[PDB]
């Protein structure tokens, strides 16, 4: 008793039917295969995460001005670790904050500078690392816009 033909000859069930792919009424299952809905409730795209992103950028600055001190001494692991441990949120933050074409292009320039810094630090060339850090500083403090 209590049948359950592929949601077509019976009913829902406090737990048994699965063919459903619907039968919920709540609203739109994004796709017939997703319990979740679309991005139209609760979380808003740009509530106050922009303040957190700006704070991340400021502390990214604060992290990046201590790199020349670490390259003055012959320490290379510290440069890579510093450039990757807290800058991790900075890539996404800078990408999301940028909205105009100039911001996009020069954020790309900043990413180029950081990648050059990483490569030169791996290759252990002090001059290239220092120049790349200077260029990264210029791009980043010219980003605050």
């Amino acid at each position: 008793s209590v049948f359950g033909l592929i949601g077509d000859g019976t009913s829902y069930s406090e737990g048994a039917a699965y063919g459903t792919d619907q039968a919920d009424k709540l609203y739109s299952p994004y796709s017939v295969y997703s319990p979740e809905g679309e991005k139209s409730l609760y979380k808003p795209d740009s509530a106050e995460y922009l303040a957190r992103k700006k704070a991340v950028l400021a502390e990214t600055k604060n992290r990046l001005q201590k790199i020349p001190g670490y390259v003055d001494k012959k320490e290379w692991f510290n440069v890579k670790d510093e450039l990757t441990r807290y800058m991790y949120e900075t890539r996404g933050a800078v990408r999301s904050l940028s909205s105009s074409v100039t911001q996009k292009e020069k954020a790309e320039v900043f990413f180029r500078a950081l990648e050059d810094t990483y490569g030169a630090a791996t290759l252990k060339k002090g001059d290239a690392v220092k120049a790349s850090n200077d260029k990264a500083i210029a791009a980043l403090d010219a980003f605050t816009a």
Binding site: S31, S34, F77, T84, R91, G92
Partner: protein, 450 residues
């Protein structure tokens, strides 16, 4: 029907494809049609995964197996491994489907209406299985094609939008590999190093520069070899150790491809560089290291002095010393001390796991990554229950690394078996006693007793 019957051929219906050994046109048709089948599966599966895609979950939780490759190539992926759009995957799928239709038509035409033997009408595509010059010519042509493909990958990574790099500064993202490593010593160090723990014969490639350089080298080698085999003829030393027949060539290919399948299976299980953990999920050792790391952080929050608490065996339950002296996580995960992950490297110094960085400079994103990886370990069941074998079934997840590794290991061994079978049969048939003994020239009766 002359060629299609156990009488005319001598081959039963179940071993029916062996009737095409000496038929050139139909064999070409079969090969082309099979390639069309491969392309069709690729396109269809890409479209299937794009249809069933859900933007909330990461790709390694959706049971996806192909979106990860195209994402690693740098298609529709943002910083941190977030998927932006799924349009390029749809484009790849539809292009593959159309090309598969074309290839299937070609295979059908060549199998049904095409001339049975290409030697008579097209004395450029005809072969004999016995002359070496034409065999080496075909081998060289396809070798040049493979070299061009390797070049194409290098070109894509260097000047066509770049590829996804986990070890990139600021997190994983798409970048251009401007300066690949071209030093032959460093490139062939992978090829000629040990396959044991701590070495990782070709699986232990770390950065993208090594990947690009190795591909440049492979393309150059393949181009040179393809040119060389086309022009030259097999030498004397190789002319008397090889069996020159179609089945022998098939057996050689089977052995080589079984080795390649084993390598790919073990390569998907250990590598983080070409298999980013943000797309395929954490590896075996990565989950264990993540568990140790997250429990270390949790116990440190309470105020316990990490790196001073003796374990139950007196060995140290948070920080240990590796048999080489490096400082590593304690517990059973000391076997995985060779691990190098993008979210754990910031904490590593020249001496190993730095302690001052752990005590002070810890990051919340590392905590989140470690918790997510511990909660998603490459553990599961055949019905995809997920978790440990004794766990109840509420989650539904099996890591794609496990699927890839298991499936390809199975296929690789069975192709090794195919190599054994076909090599034995090819050599016996070339010798001339693959059907029986003789009953009048039995070699055992002509040999000294013992």
């Amino acid at each position: 029907i002359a060629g299609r019957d156990i009488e005319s051929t001598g081959f039963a219906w179940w071993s029916g494809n062996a009737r095409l050994i000496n038929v050139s046109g139909k064999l070409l048709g079969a090969h082309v049609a099979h390639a069309g089948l491969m392309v069709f599966w690729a396109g269809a599966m890409v479209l299937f995964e794009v249809s069933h895609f859900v933007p909330e979950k990461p790709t390694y939780e959706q049971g996806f197996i192909l979106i990860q490759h195209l994402a690693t190539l740098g298609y529709g992926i943002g910083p941190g491994g977030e998927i932006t759009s799924t349009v390029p995957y749809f484009a790849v799928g539809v292009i593959h489907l159309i090309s598969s239709a074309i290839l299937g038509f070609g295979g059908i035409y060549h199998s049904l209406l095409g001339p049975d033997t290409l030697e008579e009408s097209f004395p450029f595509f005809g072969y004999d299985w016995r002359d070496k010059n034409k065999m080496t010519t075909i081998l060289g042509i396809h070798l040049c094609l493979l070299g061009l493909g390797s070049f194409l990958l290098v070109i894509k990574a260097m000047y066509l939008g770049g590829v996804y790099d986990t070890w990139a500064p600021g997190g994983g993202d798409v970048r251009y590999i401007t300066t690949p490593t071209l030093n032959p010593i460093v490139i062939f160090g992978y090829v000629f190093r040990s396959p044991f723990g701590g070495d990782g014969w070709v699986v232990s490639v770390n950065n993208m520069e090594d990947v690009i350089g190795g591909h440049i080298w492979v393309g150059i080698l393949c181009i040179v070899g393809g040119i060389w085999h086309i022009f030259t003829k097999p030498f004397a030393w190789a002319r008397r150790a090889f069996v020159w027949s179609g089945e022998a060539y098939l057996s050689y290919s089977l052995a080589a491809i079984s080795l390649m399948g084993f390598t790919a299976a073990l390569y998907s299980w250990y590598n983080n560089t070409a298999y980013p953990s943000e797309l395929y999920g954490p590896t075996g050792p990565e989950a264990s290291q993540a568990q140790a790391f997250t429990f270390l952080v949790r116990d440190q929050r309470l105020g316990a002095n990490v790196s001073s608490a003796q374990g139950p065996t007196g060995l140290g339950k948070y920080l240990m010393r590796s048999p080489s002296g490096e400082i590593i996580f304690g517990g059973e995960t000391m076997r995985f001390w060779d691990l190098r992950a993008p979210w754990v490297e910031p904490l590593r110094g020249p001496n190993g796991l730095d302690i001052n960085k752990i005590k002070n400079d810890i990051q919340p994103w590392q905590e989140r990554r470690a918790a997510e990886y511990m909660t998603h370990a490459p553990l599961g069941s055949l019905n995809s229950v997920g978790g440990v074998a004794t766990e109840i079934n509420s989650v539904n997840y099996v890591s794609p690394r496990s699927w890839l590794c298991c499936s390809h290991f199975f296929l690789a061994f069975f192709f090794l078996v195919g190599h054994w079978w076909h090599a034995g049969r090819a050599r016996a048939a070339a010798a001339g006693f693959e059907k029986g003994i003789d009953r009048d020239f039995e070699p055992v009766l002509s040999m000294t007793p013992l």
